[PDB]
C-alpha cells in the first residue's frame with residue numbers, strides 16, 4: 001500500500017491507528033529513532049518536558065499520542081517541533097469494544113489501586129496498544145505517577161516488549177508542587193496547603209542520612225503541620241515498589257485529599 | 273548476535289538470542305514465520321511448518337515450550353526449518369506470573385467453562401512468543417478452534433502487527449483429527465474415536481436440512497459409539513459469538529474416551545449455503 005503522507009519538519013496529525021503505524025514503520029526504515037510521548041486530557045508543562053527529553057535523542061522523530069484549545073495543544077506541539085500527533089477516537093482504539101485486556105500484577109492493587117482498583121488495567125491495556133501501533137524505540141512517562149511508571153516497566157518486562165521505558169523527573173511549580181492538571185481546581189487555602197506534600201518528601205530525603213524512621217517521621221511532621229490535608233498513605237518502598245530494604249535506594253510515596261482533590265507525589269530516597 | 277547458520281537447524285534457548293537473530297533476518301529482507309508448538313510433534317505440526325515454508329523468502333521459527341525433543345528436532349531438521357526456539361521456564365518467567373492477558377468472555381465458554389484461567393495462560397505465552405520473535409505470520413491448526421479464535425482476538429485487540437494463519441486440521445486416514453493426545457487411546461478407544469469426525473461430517477451433510485437435523489445427526493452418531501462420553505456438542509457462529517448463527521458456522525465437539533478428552537470441529541453451512 002502507499003505510505004500515508006508525511007511531511008518532515010511539520011506537525012503531521014493522524015487519527016487512524018493504521019496510518020500512524022505505516023508512517024512510523026516507514027520512518028524506522030529511513031533511519032529515524034521513533035520516540036513516543038503518551039498524553040491524556042489537556043496538555044501541561046509536564047508533557048512538554050517529556051517532549052523535550054524525547055527530542056534530544058539524536059535522529060529522533062517524536063510521536064505524541066493524545067487521548068482525551070485542542071487546536072492550541074497541537075500548536076504547542078508544533079512549536080515544540082513534534083512531527084507526529086496521534087489523535088484516535090475511542091471507536092478506532094476499541095472497534096470491537098472491551099475484549100482482550102491486560103491484567104496487571106498484584107502491585108496494581110496497592111496504593112492508588114485501593115481507591116481505584118481497575119484503573120491500572122485500563123492504563124496498561126491502552127499503553128500496550130499504543131506501543132504496538134507506534135512501535136517506538138523509547139516511550140516517555142513522568143515519574144509523578146510513579147506506580148503507573150513501575151507498572152508499565154513490569155508490562156514491558158513481562159510481555160518481552162522491545163521498547164525502552166524512560167521516566168522523566170517530575171516538573172514542579174516554583175514552590176515544589178508536582179505538576180498535575182488537578183492543581184487548577186485548588187482554591188488558595190488548598191493551594192497553599194498542597195505545598196506540604198513536596199515539602200514533606202524533600203525533608204524526608206534529606207533526613208534520610210539519619211535512617212528510615214527519621215525520614216518517615218520528618219515527612220509526617222510536615223504533613224501534620226498542614227490544615228485540610230487528609231493523608232491517604234505515606235509509604236517508603238524499594239525502587240520497584242516492593243518492600244524497602246534495610247538500607248539502599250528507595251522511593252517515598254504520598255497521597256492526600258484536599259477538599260475534593262486527590263494529590264500525589266513521590267521522591268527518591270537513599271537510606272543512611 | 274549469536275551465530276546463525278543458514279540452511280541448517282539453529283537451536284536457541286535464550287529469548288534475547290532468538291529475538292536478535294529474528295530482527296537481523298527481518299532487516300535483511302527475510303520474512304519470519306512462527307510455528308508455536310508444545311513439542312510431541314506430529315504430522316499436524318509438520319503441516320504447519322510446510323505451510324510456513326511455502327511463504328516466499330520465509331525463515332521458519334518453531335517454538336517448543338510447555339507452560340509450567342530427540343524426536344522433535346530431528347523432524348525439524350529433516351523439514352528444513354532453520355530456527356528452533358526452546359526457552360527454559362526460568363527465562364520465560366523470571367518473575368513468576370505477574371502481568372497477564374485477560375481474554376474476553378469467549379474464554380469462559382466451551383473448554384474454558386471448567387478451566388476458567390486456562391486461556392489467560394495460553395494468550396499470555398502466545399503474546400510473549402510474538403513479542404520475542406516478532407514474526408510476520410504465525411501458524412495454528414484449526415483443530416483447537418476456540419484457541420485460534422481467541423488468538424485472533426488477541427492480535428486484533430492489542431494491535432499486533434502479525435498475520436494469524438489457520439491451517440486446516442490434518443486427519444488420520446479414517447478422519448480422526450491429529451492430536452498429541454491420540455497416543456493415549458487403547459485400541460478399543462482408538463476404534464471408537466472415529467465417531468467424533470464421523471459425527472461432524474454427518475452433520476455437515478445433514479445441514480441442507482437445517483441446524484437441528486445437523487446437530488441431531490451428529491448426536492446419533494455419538495450415541496451409537498461405545499464408551500464415547502460427550503462433554504459438549506455445539507453449533508456456533510465462526511467467531512464463536514456473541515452473535516446468533518446465520519447460514520455458516522462451526523460445529524464443535526468435545527468427548528471423553530476413558531480418561532482421554534478429544535476435541536474436533538468442522539465448518540458447517542446451514543440450508544442453502546450447504
Ligand SMILES: COc1ccc2c(c1)cc(C(=O)NS(=O)(=O)Cc1ccc(C(F)(F)F)cc1)n2CC(=O)O
Nearest residue numbers: 038039040046049123126127142144145170171179
Ligand atoms: C516531566 O514531569 C511531569 C510531571 C507531571 C506529569 C507528567 C510529567 C506527565 C503527566 C501526565 O499527565 N501523564 S499522562 O497521564 O498524560 C500519561 C498517560 C497515562 C495514560 C494514558 C493512557 F491513555 F494510556 F491511559 C496516556 C498517557 N503528569 C501529571 C500526572 O502524571 O498526573
Ligand SMILES: COc1ccc2c(c1)cc(C(=O)NS(=O)(=O)Cc1ccc(C(F)(F)F)cc1)n2CC(=O)O
Nearest residue numbers: 308309310316317397398413416440441442450451
Ligand atoms: C494442521 O493440523 C494440525 C492438527 C493437529 C494439531 C496441529 C495441527 C497443531 C496442534 C497442536 O498441538 N497445536 S498447539 O496447541 O500445540 C499450538 C500451541 C499452543 C500454545 C502454545 C504455548 F507455548 F503457548 F503454550 C504453543 C503452541 N495439533 C494438536 C492440537 O491442537 O491438539
